[PDB]
Design a protein around this ligand. Structure first.
Ligand code: MN
Ligand code: MN
Lengths: 205, 205
């Protein structure tokens, strides 16, 4: 069975950038609900129920017809939130190989930040903005709802290995930012975990 | 150009069902933003800017290619919220021709309610649930994001004239209900304005 993962930090660990109350609600309510609903849909599927969630979301076309949507949505939700928590941490710096690769692929760090900000702001409705590794090249993409680039292009409209991501569902920013998503996107730069991003970049897979 | 409409009531008129803080934010921030962003897109289109928003969204096919998305999203948002405010009121009773048509087309009011709740609950991500009239038959449909059944099947995946509807974007329920959308949907039955739904039905049946 999937479980709600413990966070790598206290709920207030991202203050003053991301608010404590939201972190707690977002974790214990929204993420928990994806875990529960994914588990319910997987009970009848022993051949899928016990795989890692990040594996399952590469396999959606393997499922029975009637399970594809519910697991896209809920295994997507579990995978994405699991990545998100580990992809946040204060006191990191974009540097080393990852910084150089970003400069290579976008021309500069500021070009990459602007492209990411634009993608995050222009995702209408619910979704996620991502930095992905697509073949040799880093890229900025967005997905709808709980879709992940790991699901591939035909399902998610994006592809590549996620390096990091920003949740732009309203629940992620309502309490502190209300409708001001650009303000929330700016605060993300203060809490994106560049150490984990670098680790993921190094691994490539 | 468009304006933020005045409401049929004070922000607290739907207590204790829908919270007054959300009513105020939802009107003055979210709806206002759709009005502003639609108006910005319409500035270069004086042939379209004069249309009632509910007519513009029936004509999205006619816009320039680079205008279609921004106005689908923002004119859809303005139309949908304008309907929503008029579509809420305490103290109404479903009755008369509209009740009878619901009993005809769904078998009973309770069957209808169960179908509406299911559509409202199963709209994954952002969107709306609707009671529509399609020519001569009532139906429950849902849409993504700020799409409306007035936009038609090709664009929105639904069609028909909206008799009433329920906003299921998270901003509409997060403060009071967090991720408990089913509890919010339950409270909608206490504030759906059956008098406005009946008037819209009388005009269109
Ligand atoms: Mn989230
Ligand atoms: Mn709304």
């Amino acid at each position: 069975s999937y479980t709600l993962p413990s966070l790598p930090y206290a709920y207030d660990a991202l203050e003053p950038h991301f608010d404590k109350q939201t972190m707690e609600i977002h974790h214990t309510k929204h993420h928990q609900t994806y875990v529960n609903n994914a588990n319910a849909a997987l009970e009848s599927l022993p051949e899928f129920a016990n795989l890692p969630v990040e594996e399952l979301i590469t396999k959606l076309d393997q499922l029975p017809a009637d399970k594809k949507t519910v697991l896209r949505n809920n295994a997507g939700g579990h995978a994405n939130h699991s990545l998100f928590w580990k992809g946040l941490k204060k006191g990191t710096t974009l540097q080393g190989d990852l910084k150089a690769a970003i400069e290579r692929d976008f021309g500069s760090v500021d070009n990459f930040k602007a492209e990411f900000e634009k993608a995050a702001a222009s995702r209408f409705g619910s979704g996620w903005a991502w930095l992905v590794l697509k073949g040799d090249k880093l890229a900025v993409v967005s997905t709808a709802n709980q879709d992940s680039p790991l699901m591939g292009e035909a399902i998610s409209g994006a592809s590549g290995f996620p390096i990091m991501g920003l949740d732009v569902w309203e629940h992620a920013y309502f309490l502190k930012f209300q409708n001001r998503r650009p303000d929330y996107i700016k605060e993300f730069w203060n809490v994106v975990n560049w150490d984990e991003a670098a680790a993921r970049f190094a691994a490539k897979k």
